Design a protein around this ligand. Structure first.
Ligand code: ZN
Ligand code: ZN
Lengths: 310, 144, 310, 144, 310, 310
């Protein structure tokens, strides 16, 4: 077969360095030459139990680009605490007789995993399960890094913002660490430091990481500068107080960046990235977003098409 | 010409002169005014400078400048001569010009003048809102 | 190329007499012989920031009739005043890397125009921007007039209803006035007269217009009778009081109409057109509505397909 | 009081000088600036006056002054001499400084520069919004 | 006149130690010997712009116990953030012409203080203004402590819970700091520790304080254990369960506690105090609540009645 | 007995001039020398089927001021019917067996009058019945004018605003017309002018009146300027701004005004009176509000207490 044919894609942590590579290779292939008839006659369910417009539009577009048909639903501020009677398991049990794959997003950690236990032979792809996993976001991140740097080893990567809750930076760090020679630079408003399990993981693999308090320290050396998204309740008016500006990246902050340096942000951004960086050659978050349709085409292609010849 | 009678505010830091003109609505007047921005001063590097004819500043008005131009000098002028000379001291209260950092402070939507108690600290100035009773670094209140 | 290839269609006031013609010509061509594979492999975004079901169904159907795939969203009574953080500009900057064109409707005047400033090479089509513009409505109006009269010059056109706010009648008047010899007849409940800029415009072009208070005065002479839609808050119980019936058009009002006279209404109608006119040969508002798929097919065809050969 | 090299904006109406300083961020510079407000002028009653060292205004920059000080004169100065002289002409577009009177205009909440087409009329100037396509008397746009 | 006659009661910080004792002495007198006709013929306005039933009930009972008449209102989700027409100022401007005193509770901070600026010679008593002040809660707390320990000086006081958002304990801390020989212990999940300016104020006054992380460390040696109410939203639901079980109190945590010690809680509680502590001699939170009507009687009495009868 | 003892108070038109003076005299008496035990042992029902907090507060204060006991309710908008089951008639049929008098406010016109048909010998006082009557508002208006001018005859009175929907001014006009020598001035945006049947009534009585379009034309020569509250829905939002600035009052509009003139307003105001007029001797709207509790005391007193003590 191909290693990912008929498999579920639930969590980054389930994927080998090879898996990662296969996805990214495929992505690039498709990006280079499109196969708009590759999934002709497939029907995919775009089940968004939790509304997320940006994510759904990307996924659906990918399905269409590969010629598949899409049905589904985006859900709503739930009156009376849900379908209430109907278990997710019953829901997945039924839907999985209609369709060929399920792409689902859900407010509960573990929903994508539960779906697979009822989906039969229908692969389910995780589009977000509460604060747990978001594999395609992570794959599009990797793909953007690889595409612009020519590589996923020997990089200098800085994570910036809420490192306590930035599930994007946890995932991306995990994945990059499946690769050799990367060095990491973490930058928080003191508060909101990185989860100790991640750091412990880096140490066993033998991976360099440094802690810092502003970007200045690190700007001249980084290849990727990855910003998290940052909530109004994630932080407060009192800890936005003396050092909140490195939390606002400006074009001026970029004078000494290497020419190759790209700025990624999983989006949306509210104030953490000023609009004047938009014009710099470093701004790459919109490009990043458009790469999502390749990561996602790739996954769908590999999972539904027995032997994917590039 | 120059001078005849009024007030001269000297030794304003660069980029403060225009700020003062704005905050204290100093040009909402019919009087003759003369302003020098980014003037050379060996005395302090470079300075802004304001001159207002036939207009005078109470001790407290002069103190209101303290937060923005602490080392300024305020000269009174009659018949072209400096008659009086004073410097701004930190006031006890600052009214009307600041705005409370607190999005939820009642003072925003309502018809009342802002007010803060001023308290000298180690490395900054503490401002406390008459209304919401929260206290802030002047750095936070002043930066937007 | 073709003059409209890769252009935005944001406002009626941006289109020449020729442009208008091209659209209508194309429309009729497509109406006569369909090209269901003209936009095979295009993906179009149907972005309805403001819900409007009639308008979205029309537009989407057109996309499907030309073979394109559709993704998008209709929006909702917005909890907490919006995506709030996310600017429209970031939204369009992202969506425009997914898709081939953007059809959007928005509650703020100027939204369509702002989109173009961030859409890159992706044409955006305005489906309604607050009380500003609604070009496809106007184009389907024109197309209906041309199809039934055989022509857009030398017509006798009456506008009826709220002329102060009827954005439909402003647009339509502007357009027809790009053509020679039309004569206009405006009819309001005294209140809600016509914007002076429109009348001033007619005068410089040298175009006949007359003011009136009932339709009787004008019925025997008109070729089109265009009715506006009329709100409950647009008017009141006190100015529905002595003359509210010409505001209610009935089959009986039509006895002396020319045989060719058609009655258009952009829809929906509430009470302003009585159902007994529905059976007359003059009722043409439903037909008008179905012509929308041709006006819209036409715009999409011309904008995405370099040289459109009929 | 004059300068060696730069621009002098003369014959600005009273109460417009400070407005010009604000709208066009003219004091956000390191250059030496000299301003006269409510100066006497037999020429026109009374006037404001701006002098900026080593700074020059393009034809269009000058033209942007037209809506606020139509009868101003813009002198170029080198080695203390007037080298050039021009007056502001109504521009075709005015960017960045007006704000649309339309509360619903997309241009308020978003990251775009305001823009208006300028059209001369009988008793006022018509301003048409690039975005919302509505047209207004400059009286309305300019008064708050 | 007594010092508080016709004075507004807005903030704990506006009261001397003398004042506090004056209130507490009056509370004690009134509790001992009721004066059900002290405020006969007075009309008090109970204005709860933000609903708070436990607060209104207490306060209104105090009023009727002194023989005063009561009028007022409770607002309905302050639906949005205000009455859309009426400024708060106008509202007070009007009410202050009907009544003899105003008791108000409001979502915005500073609302009580603002009212004083339009209420004429009508005193206003702050019953809670957003997250700023609630003085009768502090006064009731104080009274309760003094009654049970016989003194307000040289006491061993524990604070437990959400010490970062818990305004109840801030105030109580501030006011207990106007007394000598007092010693504090603060118990909190680290990212919820007691705001610094408090401690700064404490060090500066020479006030012994110790930060701890479990009740046990200190249980043996405190006179008051004052519990606040940790939320299920503030800390997230993973970290919650991992450290929740020390901010919960069971009777079994009371084996080595002093025979004078009382457990306090402003109420309501949910799970932070197990019901098995209710039956012990230490539980005093319901008693505390009851004392509310004496603190509150005292304050109304002092304010409205020029000379007090002890 | 006095003429009003045990009578229903439903409509201004049901009162003679004698009646009015009787009420106003009693108001003045009660304001001068309170009778906090006049209605001791009476129980009044405060029935607000339609919520109106400024109205209830005032009315209930009046009740406690006379030492009466108050029971009642405020109804909650409309899930659908507040009532559904119970006819209003049944509801009054029941309540009229509990209480000594009924004060009601209701969304339907004629509701108060209907109540009188089922209340037995229990008097009802109309506190507002849709867009029909609100007598205590008129009476408080009258009392306020008389107190400040010393007389209710030969006065120069201005009305300003929404004179088509503003029932407050209709009533005040009607009742001032039962007085001699009075002269009116009506200020309105044209499509909101004063209903005709009023004027007809005025011409027929020989009452001097003048329609104007700006406050200025008359400011110099009026004794009362009574402002109503123009809405943002009634006139649209484009015509609003074009003529809004004369139905707004600033202190600067009071340069040439008489030293006896008072500005009235039933309240609440939003922007129609700038706050700078507050500090002037002419602002009397808050005073006016205060007088509400005297007008209302008077009415309750007269109705429930057979013979009055002036
Ligand atoms: Zn505040
Ligand atoms: Zn605009």
């Amino acid at each position: 077969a191909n290693p990912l044919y008929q498999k579920h894609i639930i969590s980054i942590n389930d994927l080998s360095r090879d898996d990662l590579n296969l996805v990214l290779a495929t992505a690039a292939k498709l990006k280079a030459n499109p196969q708009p008839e590759l999934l002709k006659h497939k029907v995919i369910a775009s089940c968004f139990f939790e509304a997320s417009t940006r994510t759904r539009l990307s996924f659906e577009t990918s399905m269409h680009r590969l010629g598949a048909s899409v049905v589904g639903f985006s859900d709503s501020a739930n009156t009376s605490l849900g379908k209430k009677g109907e278990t997710l398991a019953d829901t997945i049990s039924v839907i999985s007789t209609y369709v060929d794959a399920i792409v689902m997003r859900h407010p509960q950690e573990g929903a994508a995993r539960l779906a697979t236990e009822f989906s039969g032979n229908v692969p389910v792809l995780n589009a977000g399960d509460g604060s747990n996993q978001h594999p395609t976001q992570t794959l599009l991140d990797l793909f953007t890094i690889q595409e612009t740097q020519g590589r996923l080893d020997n990089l200098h990567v800085a994570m910036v913002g809420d490192l306590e809750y930035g599930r994007t930076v946890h995932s991306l760090t995990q994945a990059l660490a499946k690769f050799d020679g990367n060095r990491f630079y973490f930058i928080a408003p003191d508060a909101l430091a990185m989860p100790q399990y991640i750091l412990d993981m880096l140490d066993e693999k033998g991976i360099a990481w440094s802690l810092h308090s502003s970007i200045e320290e690190v700007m001249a050396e980084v290849d990727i500068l990855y910003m998290t998204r940052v909530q109004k309740e994630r932080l407060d008016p009192s800890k936005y107080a003396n050092v909140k500006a490195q939390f606002v990246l400006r074009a001026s902050d970029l004078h000494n960046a290497k020419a190759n340096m790209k700025v990624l942000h999983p989006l949306p951004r509210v104030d953490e990235i000023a609009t004047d960086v938009d014009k710099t050659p470093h701004a790459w978050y919109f490009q990043q977003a458009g790469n999502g349709i390749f990561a996602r085409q790739a996954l769908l292609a590999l999972v539904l098409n027995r032997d994917l010849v590039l | 010409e120059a001078i005849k009678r009024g007030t001269v505010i000297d030794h304003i830091p660069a980029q403060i002169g225009f700020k003062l003109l704005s905050l204290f609505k100093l040009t909402e007047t019919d009087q003759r005014i003369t302003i020098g921005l980014n003037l050379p001063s060996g005395e302090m590097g470079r300075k802004d400078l304001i001159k207002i004819e036939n207009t005078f500043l109470s001790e407290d008005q002069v103190d209101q400048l303290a937060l923005y131009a602490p080392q300024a000098t305020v000269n009174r002028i009659d018949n072209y001569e400096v008659v009086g000379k004073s410097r701004p001291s930190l006031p006890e209260r600052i009214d009307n010009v600041l705005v409370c950092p607190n999005s939820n402070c009642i003072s925003h939507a309502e018809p009342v003048s802002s007010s803060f108690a001023v308290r000298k600290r180690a490395n900054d100035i503490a401002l406390k809102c008459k209304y919401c009773e929260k206290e802030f670094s002047h750095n936070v209140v002043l930066a937007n």
